[PDB]
Design a protein around this ligand. Sequence first.
Ligand SMILES: *[C@@H]1O[C@H](CO)[C@@H](O)[C@H](O)[C@H]1NC(C)=O
Lengths: 50, 49
Amino acid sequence: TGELFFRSGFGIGMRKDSPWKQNVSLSILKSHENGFMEDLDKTWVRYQEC
Amino acid sequence: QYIDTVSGLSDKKFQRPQDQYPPFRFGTVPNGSTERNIRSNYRDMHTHM
Ligand SMILES: *[C@@H]1O[C@H](CO)[C@@H](O)[C@H](O)[C@H]1NC(C)=O
């Protein structure tokens, strides 16, 4: 029914003060400018078919 | 009825840039000022722009 009316995002979840809280967050940024994550969508967001 | 002359930025046709026969344009003149604004957060557009 139209378009969205409240914006937000997804994300991984880690207990506060866990060691990986830094390296994880990084490889996500790298993946956007790289182009892998974006190209991943079509493989599972495939066509419309309608 | 005719089509609705879709509305501003957040319309349904844009934020789903997976399309090859929508309004297929995102011209946004090369090296312009608004070339940077579409490189702020969301790679959804700059890839089809
Ligand atoms: C995580 O990042 C730090 C700092 O760049 C680095 O020393 C470490 O080898 C990386 N990997 C792990 C497992 O922490």
